[PDB]
Amino acid sequence: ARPRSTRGQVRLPGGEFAMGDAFGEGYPADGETPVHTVRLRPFHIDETAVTNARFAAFVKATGHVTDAERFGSSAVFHLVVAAPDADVLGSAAGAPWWINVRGAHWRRPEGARSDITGRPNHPVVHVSWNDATAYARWAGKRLPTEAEWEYAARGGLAGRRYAWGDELTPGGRWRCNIWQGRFPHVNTAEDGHLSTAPVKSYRPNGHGLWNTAGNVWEWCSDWFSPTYYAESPTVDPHGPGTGAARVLRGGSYLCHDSYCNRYRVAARSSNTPDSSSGNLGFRCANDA
């Protein structure tokens, strides 16, 4: 391990909390139930998702090549594709709004005709689980467990639907970056952002974490299993020992009811560790 750094991290006391979907709003294969008691020891977690600027420092220091670069392409939402026609490789068979764009990666998130010069304080995207874990190691940190992630995101509140409470738009107003309008064709940007927002935007939750709901998906250390909640230990669960996909949490700027409720604090998903997309980043953590 590199010398530890809790820079840009808040220390949370842990303790017991009720992990899982209280409301039964996820779909069966997500395994958000049963609601089960988890006991966490005190730990540190990034107040924000990792930014473009910090990931640049990592790459400058290490020469890290991301999976998206190695594979040669990454998934870009159809509306923002900024590339020559020859770099469009085809849409995702299952999700036609996801475009496979040659050369799309963290530096050029919409393809070769894009850059991040205006987005240093935006979350880094097109980063795989591998990229995320490599960053954390150089940075003197780790990824949070899924349990740590949910605890931190709940912000000291018990059994709420969202990081801040049960109403999605309290007082009719937005405090997270998701999708409003006719998905996947029209984004009304009611929440003030079409694509990613700065990592500190809106306001923090009760634990001082910003944007755990929406903006970008966030990789956790755990292997995903839809039955793990039923077989989880009480103290510091790390997920199952083997698996195919790693856990991601939070939902993104592309989330809308019609197909997605993933901004709920208890919502969970997963992806193969080497996968990447323009709506998927991460935040780091540490033991106390």
Can residue 47 be called a binding residue for Ca ion (CB under 5 A)?
no
Would you say 122 or 142 has its CB closer to Ca ion? 122
Annotated binding site for Cu(2+): 255, 260
Write out the H or E segment, with its range, that includes residue 223.
strand 217-223
Can residue 122 be called a binding residue for Ca ion (CB under 5 A)?
no
Can residue 211 be called a binding residue for Ca ion (CB under 5 A)?
no
Report the nearest approach of Ca ion to the CB of residue 47 (Å). Answer: 21
Can residue 67 be called a binding residue for Ca ion (CB under 5 A)?
no
DSSP 172: G
Can residue 279 be called a binding residue for Ca ion (CB under 5 A)?
no
Would you say 100 or 261 has its CB closer to Ca ion? 261
Can residue 283 be called a binding residue for Ca ion (CB under 5 A)?
no
Q: Smallest Cα–Cα separation from 215: which of 146, 82, 125?
A: 125
Contact pattern from residue 158 through residue 177 relative to Ca ion, giving x for each residue in contact according to CB under 5 A and a dash for the rest: -------------------x
| Interactions with Ca ion, residue window 232-261 (CB under 5 A) | 253
137 class by beta-carbon count within 10 Å (0-12 exposed, 13-18 middle, 19+ buried):
middle
Interatomic CA distance for residues 155 and 162, integer angstroms = 10
Q: Smallest Cα–Cα separation from 79: which of 211, 189, 168, 219?
A: 189
Site size with Ca ion, rule: CB under 5 A: 4
Would you say 139 or 213 has its CB closer to Ca ion? 213
Alpha-carbon separation of residue 151 from 42, 83, 144, 234 (angstroms):
11, 40, 10, 13
- Tell me if residue 45 falls in helix, strand or coil: strand
Report the nearest approach of Ca ion to the CB of residue 234 (Å). Answer: 37
Q: Which residues, 6 or more positions from 287, have their beta carbon under 8 angstroms from its beta carbon?
A: 41, 43, 44, 142
| Interactions with Ca ion, residue window 175-204 (CB under 5 A) | 177, 191, 193
Would you say 19 or 267 has its CB closer to Ca ion? 267
Residues that bind Ca ion (CB under 5 A): 177, 191, 193, 253
